[PDB]
């Protein structure tokens, strides 16, 4: 009976409801991020349930303020909620301190909020995990946040169903390029990694979505990868996919 109410500590000191929330996450689309030399790339797998979907429209990556990019996997709506709060939290930070919210600051903000939803049985944990980051006064930052509110910084991160395949791919990158990775490369790389991770869900045709926040390619602001730069990586992935 220790898994029926949220805040309940099982006899092993685990919060079961949090853990089930993770399952909701696992059942979701794959998404990743790659911290690069001076920015971060975000990419996600958009599952095309049917031809009736208007192409390149149901955008899933979101921005917070003007420099933080956010992507998550799990119950989509729960993510939106988390972002909205991020936005409110970011503004309040700017209003009072003028400087846009530093990513570590932002992260802790989201963290504290989520952690709170595992404190009372009158709330259910968030059925999502978010990967986000951006550029700030001192470097790039990539973070991943889980339903328990836990979050840490990453060099690369992934989540969703193709998660293990993806992480594997990310790990390769960290070991082959300790120097860093140019924003352009990471883009292509993310494209690949997603294509790859897509195999754990190898049954439906997909639409890739990528975004970046680079100090040299986007001035430190979050912009989506579209047009020429997007086709380039789609093909790069379509290439190394065989």
């Amino acid at each position: 009976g220790y898994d029926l109410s949220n805040s309940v500590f099982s006899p092993d000191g685990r919060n079961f409801q949090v853990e089930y929330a993770v399952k909701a996450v696992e059942n979701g689309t794959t998404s990743i991020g790659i911290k690069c030399n001076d920015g971060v790339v975000f990419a996600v797998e958009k599952l095309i349930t049917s031809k009736l979907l208007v192409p390149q429209k149901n955008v899933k990556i979101q921005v917070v303020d003007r420099h933080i990019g956010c992507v998550y996997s799990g119950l989509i709506p729960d993510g939106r909620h988390l972002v909205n709060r991020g936005r409110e939290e970011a503004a309040s930070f700017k209003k009072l301190y003028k400087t846009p919210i530093p990513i570590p600051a932002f992260a802790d903000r989201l963290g504290q909020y989520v952690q709170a939803h595992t404190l009372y049985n009158s709330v259910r944990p968030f059925g999502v995990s978010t990967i986000f980051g951006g550029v700030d006064k001192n470097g790039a930052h990539l973070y991943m946040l889980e339903p328990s509110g836990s979050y840490w910084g990453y060099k690369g991160a992934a989540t969703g169903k193709g998660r293990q395949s993806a992480k594997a791919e990310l790990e390769k990158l960290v070991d082959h390029h300790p120097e860093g990775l140019s924003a352009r490369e990471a883009v292509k790389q993310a494209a690949k990694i997603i294509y790859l991770a897509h195999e754990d869900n190898k049954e439906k045709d997909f639409e890739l979505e990528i975004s970046w926040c680079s100090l040299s390619e986007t001035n430190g602001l979050h912009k989506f990868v579209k047009g020429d730069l997007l086709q380039e990586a789609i093909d790069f992935a379509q290439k190394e996919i065989n």
Partner: protein
């Protein structure tokens, strides 16, 4: 009777008891000791995933200019305690005109924990907090609080799964030396002593990326970096 903090027929609070188990979920051990004029706290640092940015993994927090706190428990509950610790510390200063005494900060945090123990809607936090500083009135200090709402001051202490091993090790040292503190004038040595006795009890060797040290001297608490740890780690590989 076992889902909210009400009493059991035996007169126990199970949820409080299970919270104590969560404190161990991380599998990190730490310890703290008091110097002649400082206080140190070592804690293991374990970065599993290669994809993690090692620099952001810590369970040691700078609460105020003079107070440091180490947490044994899950990260979420840890940070949740930190933020409040920080705030409470600030508010204390603003309202009273002098920095919040570590022991006072601890009692405060303890009182907040007691509340989750008595109110059904609040789950306790599965974390144990060790507060350290060099009190302007009390000197080097270590005050630890737990999910039961208990808090007390220590000559030295340790926390983690291998708590008892470390404790006995230290218990022995103090029974031998007769004093309630390491007898060294510099923090560097106390840090050493600390890491030494850690190695001694856990039976393991530490590199620079496996430790996390925090020091508190008059008017300031800081965390050493890898490089600073090394100078300690090196200096130790000569006595042992």
């Amino acid at each position: 009777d076992r889902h909210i903090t009400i009493f059991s027929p035996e007169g126990r609070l199970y949820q409080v008891e299970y919270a104590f188990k969560a404190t161990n979920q991380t599998n990190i051990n730490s310890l703290a000791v008091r110097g002649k004029d400082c206080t140190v706290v070592i804690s293991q640092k374990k970065v599993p995933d290669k994809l993690l940015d090692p620099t952001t993994v810590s369970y040691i927090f700078c609460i105020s200019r003079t107070i440091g706190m180490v947490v044994n428990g899950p990260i979420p509950d840890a940070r949740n305690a930190a933020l409040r610790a920080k705030a409470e510390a600030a508010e204390f200063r603003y309202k009273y005109g002098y920095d919040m005494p570590c022991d006072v900060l601890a009692k405060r945090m303890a009182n907040l924990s007691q509340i989750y123990t008595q109110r059904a809607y609040m789950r306790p936090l599965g974390v144990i907090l060790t507060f350290v500083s060099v009190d302007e009135e009390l000197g080097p200090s270590i005050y630890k609080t737990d999910p039961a709402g208990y808090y007390v001051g220590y000559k030295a202490t340790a926390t983690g799964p291998k708590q008892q091993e470390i404790t006995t090790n230290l218990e022995n040292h103090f029974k031998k030396s007769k004093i309630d503190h390491i007898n060294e004038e510099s923090w560097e040595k106390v840090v050493e002593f600390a890491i030494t006795h850690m190695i001694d009890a856990l039976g393991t060797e530490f590199s620079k990326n496996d430790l996390e040290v925090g020091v508190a001297t008059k008017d300031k608490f800081f965390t050493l970096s890898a490089e600073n740890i090394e100078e300690r780690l090196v200096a130790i590989a000569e006595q042992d």
